[PDB]
UniProtKB/TrEMBL annotation, chains F, G:
Source organism, top-level taxon: Viruses
Included range, full protein: 58 to 113 of 169
Name the record gives this protein: BplB
Organism, as annotated: Escherichia phage P1 (Bacteriophage P1)
Automatic annotation (TrEMBL), chain H:
Gene (name only): 22
Residues of the full protein shown: 425 to 528 of 529
Organism for this UniProt entry: Escherichia phage P1
Protein name: Gp22
Length: 526, 167, 55, 167, 167, 56, 56, 104
């Protein structure tokens, strides 16, 4: 045996880092069955843009979870972590107005100048300044310090001059790590050792995920750069994130609305603003999609019911939107600190588990509630308001879902009701879900049929609908009517009627599968 | 002649749609063996198998003649028959000679690689259809040579004994 | 489930031709893969042991 | 019908090139036996074999029902079935008579001689495809004669037991 | 496709000439039995055999798993299956009846008489292809008669046990 | 084509692997100089594979 | 030809050993002197092998 | 820093270049001669053989780059200038390994 190094350099060897007394190892896996969406507040991220996060990116994208001692800023990341165990999704970040990002400007001689600007604003280069480098990622450099280093390199083959640009990260303790390195040339027509272009803005846009640059065209030609040691970004900060105005929330919701990624669920990740919830419900009803929302968990049983009516969801417009209430407490995963947060992303997990059962059409008839699909996996549950009992009938009348202890011992969601006051077989969760899935399939079929030579035709619209309805019958979503005498044995009826010649009409009826939720036993004695 | 005959093609159509609802049927010609560190022999395999996947059974006769069969311990070790083709450079013979010369245990991975589930020129495997065997011993059988078999190619028969099945 | 005795898209069964087995154990067998069998599909063989027959 | 179907002929082309990368496949009609000092009989052989190449196996049941198969001693001796054609001068019968009359041990070499690897009128052998058997005993079998077999030539069957395999 | 292919027809011509250098192949329909003093039955034989001509083998397991097979004493006695045709005068039945009635030992000579090696109307035999059995016992078997076999002739099966093979 | 039988008597034919190798028949005419005879003699004497292009 | 099946359903045909012996048909005419009949009788009576040269 | 200080990267390209030189020397004896169509089929066969041998692998990031290990294309500017180029993605070597022990 021989010596063992602690860190790897450029030599060929095997290195072992010192033993770490405390650390956590987390695995990951990717899946794209169903796509969710939402809004929230996080540590770092490009604000007001759609971000795609998977199980292996939700730490790099987004950021390190915020400490619960800060207050009301930790819920969204916990909801995202709970929901991401099934499938990936999309997130839009909302940031307060008093938020700035750092930037360093460079003089013709090469000295740096530090400043910061609001996220909305655009960089304007003062006369006498050659170029500026700023941070594209919405990451303030307060607790982790980011330093920039410049040194010279060999000139180009054609004679152009280029330099090495390096980025480093230093913690509060003093541990220094290396993030990125680049070869950059100020000349417009320059090439890398690999043949790629070395123009600073183009290279930074292409092969860098942290930095961007803006140059002044007039004065770029007669510019010189000298070697500089580590230079740290300053002035970049995030305002008090516990106080977010409704305007930012509405802007994030509007950003979600105009997205082409075609997700299949919308989630309220710890957002307790009524206007934002109503806007999210409007988005949910627009796209024929399911939706899950949550009321504030700290409210007692008595105050929870009016809080459901406070949001505008309770009515006939917003069908297939569920509201939950979870006043219990549990130990946080990252730090065992006894945090309280609601149930959003646990219901979606149950729905995704139900959807994964069937592979042809998805099997949307499975209800989220149940002791098998819906389980709450948390460390230790302690009721916030013991010796208190909810009024179950009032909750049912109020379209509020309840949580109960299962046979095994873990917490279980025991009901699934949508926000529809009328008695239409629609307050059951799956009944709107089947029809929404069928409607989406029909829309996709009709879009493709429009490219046919004839186009949309009544004869053409019947064959495809028969095929899809037969597939849905095969999956078990549609069943025969209960009374064979009154109604025919067929599960669905598709008929076409013609009045005059200008008006046609295509209609199909369906008999949805029922759920089993109330059971009664009657003992006797011989 | 028969008074119970009655036709119903909606039921048959429903059965057809239900059967066709599932994706495909795996053709028996699509598989791959790995052989751990000797990955150059994977091309020459021509026949393989999946382990038994059974348990021992315990029989107990109760009162009167009542009998019950009960689950027993898992069966670990078994045999697998593998056939390979032979080239004019003695790849299979050299492999068998090396394996006999030095006592070794080789890990063998069997997986199904259909054409439908593939990206580019590289096959992609699925966890559901992948099985593994550890601590295997590779043995040979007698190899038959004969004239008047001008239309045939020599095919050694290999016998592999595994000691653990993992998935 | 014969075709003659069926209503709608659902098959109907009869008590005379229906039998049941309880407390069964499902076991697999060796599954054969080979090339040159381009016209065949893989068919596993299952061995099931029952412990009571009821009707 | 099936929604999982997808065609990909680049993958099949890659498989075809990978299989064709190796040289050829040995035809079963190309071999040669030497029989040590009696090299005039090598022409008349019509069927041969390769020794078993196996080991004895040792079975041990661990705690609960865990079972392990372990390598054992090599297998030295065995049998090989060899068929020869018969001439009207009794070369094979005289050979067998002489072998029975005097107790002898003969070394037998089996080699593969493809047409592709040959120079001039002389075949060349390769170390990878060449095997040797030492201290062999040659025994005969019942030889069948019958009328109404006008289209067949008499083919005696020989049984050879070897005692050591060397390469 | 295959980069190892190379044609060589001089080698094949050499193998052809080497194989054709030897004379002929003995057709299995050319043989003759004598049956010692009963030489009139030699015509009616239809199937014959050559004795086993083997030895006993002694197995010894040496140190570790080393095994050696060793020659043993010659095998003298055995069985030979012979089929004869039957005439309407009961030649074979009378022969078998006479053999059973009196305990006798009959010497049988087995020879090969090809058409090429013959002078005049008399066949000539060669010492290399001639074998002899001494002190033989001739036994019969069950003989099958049936209708609807209009195209077949009755063929008794004979079982002969020899006690010494001499050449 | 892979052949399968479902519940009751329903039957499905499924796409299978592609057919690569096959046979094709070509008829040609012979000249005095023995062009085709010499071509075939050369092909038999030495093993080789050639590439044929067919155009309509 | 030797047929082999590779991974999946690919198939390759390979050159094999040469075909030596075969059969050929010849038709001739007969003269009064029994030339062909006597030729065939002599060939059947005595086993022999002859060499035939065919020219185009 | 051209990925060329590694030993095998220049060796693969040199072997491919030698094979191409031998291929193009033979094609000069073809009745047509050297042609753009002729230079594509042989090179595709050769690069497929190298792909089968394991020298060329698919790009690490399937989103940014395609799934093909090599890209062969022919470019035409006016009529007198033709151009044949092929790109390759060589196999990597494992030389630096790091282990990070933790404690529960």
């Amino acid at each position: 045996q021989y010596s063992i190094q602690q860190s790897l350099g450029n030599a060929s060897g095997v290195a072992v880092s010192p033993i770490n007394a405390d650390a956590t190892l987390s695995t990951g896996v990717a899946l794209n069955s169903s796509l969710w969406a939402g809004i929230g507040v996080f540590a770092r991220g490009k604000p007001f843009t759609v971000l795609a996060v998977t199980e292996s990116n939700y730490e790099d994208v987004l950021g390190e979870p915020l400490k619960p001692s800060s207050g009301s800023q930790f819920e969204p990341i916990r909801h995202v972590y709970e929901a991401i165990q099934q499938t990936s999704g999309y997130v839009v970040r909302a940031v307060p107005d008093d938020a700035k990002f750092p930037i360093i400007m460079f003089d013709e001689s090469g000295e740096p100048a530090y400043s910061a600007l609001p996220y909305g604003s655009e960089i304007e280069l003062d006369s006498g300044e050659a170029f500026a480098i700023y941070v594209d990622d919405g990451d303030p450099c307060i607790s982790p310090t980011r330093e920039l280093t410049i040194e010279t390199a060999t000139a180009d083959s054609a004679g152009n001059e280029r330099f090495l640009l390096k980025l480093t990260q230093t913690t509060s303790l003093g541990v220094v790590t290396t993030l990125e390195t680049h070869t950059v040339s100020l000349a417009e027509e320059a090439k890398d050792d690999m043949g790629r272009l070395c123009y600073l803005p183009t290279a930074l846009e292409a092969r860098s995920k942290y930095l961007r640059a803006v140059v002044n065209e007039e004065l770029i030609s007669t510019a010189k750069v000298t070697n500089k040691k580590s230079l740290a970004f300053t002035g970049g900060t995030n305002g008090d994130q516990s106080k977010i105005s409704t305007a930012a929330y509405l802007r994030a919701v509007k950003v979600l609305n105009n997205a082409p990624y075609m997700y299949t669920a919308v989630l309220g990740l710890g957002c307790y603003d009524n206007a934002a919830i109503t806007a999210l419900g409007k988005i949910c009803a627009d796209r024929l999609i399911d939706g899950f929302f949550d009321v504030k968990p700290t409210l007692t049983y008595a105050e929870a019911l009016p809080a459901v009516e406070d949001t505008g969801l309770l009515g006939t417009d917003y069908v297939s939107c569920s509201v939950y209430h979870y006043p219990f407490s549990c130990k946080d995963k990252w730090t065992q600190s006894r945090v309280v947060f609601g149930l959003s992303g646990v219901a979606y997990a149950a729905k995704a588990r139900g959807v994964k059962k069937n592979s042809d059409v998805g099997g949307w008839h499975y209800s989220p509630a149940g002791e098998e699909r819906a389980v709450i996996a948390r460390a230790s549950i302690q009721p916030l308001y013991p010796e208190d009992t909810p009024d179950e009938e009032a909750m049912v009348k109020g379209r509020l879902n309840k949580v109960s202890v299962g046979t095994s011992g873990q917490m279980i969601i025991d009901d699934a009701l949508t926000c529809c006051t009328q008695d239409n077989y629609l307050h059951f969760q799956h009944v709107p879900s089947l029809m929404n899935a069928i409607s989406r399939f029909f829309v996709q079929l009709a879009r493709q049929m429009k490219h046919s030579p004839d186009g949309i035709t009544a004869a053409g619209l019947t064959k495809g609908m028969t095929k899809l309805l037969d597939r849905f019958v095969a999956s078990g979503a549609l069943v025969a009517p209960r009374d064979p005498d009154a109604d025919g044995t067929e599960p669905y009826v598709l008929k076409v009627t013609q009045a005059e010649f200008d008006k046609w009409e295509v209609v199909w009826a369906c008999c949805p599968t029922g759920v089993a939720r109330r059971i009664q036993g009657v003992p006797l004695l011989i | 002649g028969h008074n119970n005959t009655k036709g119903n093609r909606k039921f048959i159509k429903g059965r057809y749609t239900a059967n066709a609802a599932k994706g495909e049927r795996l053709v028996s010609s699509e598989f791959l063996l790995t052989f751990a560190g000797h990955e150059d022999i994977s091309v020459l395999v021509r026949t393989s198998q999946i382990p038994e996947m059974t348990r021992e059974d315990v029989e107990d006769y109760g009162p009167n003649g009542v009998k019950f069969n009960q689950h027993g311990p898992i069966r670990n070790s078994g045999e697998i028959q593998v056939q390979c083709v032979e080239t004019i450079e003695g790849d299979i013979l050299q492999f068998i000679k090396d394996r006999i010369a030095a006592k070794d245990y080789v890990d063998i991975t069997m997986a199904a690689t259909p054409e439908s589930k593939s990206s580019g020129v590289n096959a992609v495997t699925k966890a559901a259809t992948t099985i593994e065997m550890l601590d295997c011993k590779i043995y040979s059988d007698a190899i038959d040579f004969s004239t008047e078999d001008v239309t045939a190619a020599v095919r050694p028969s290999l016998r592999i004994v595994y000691n653990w099945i993992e998935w």
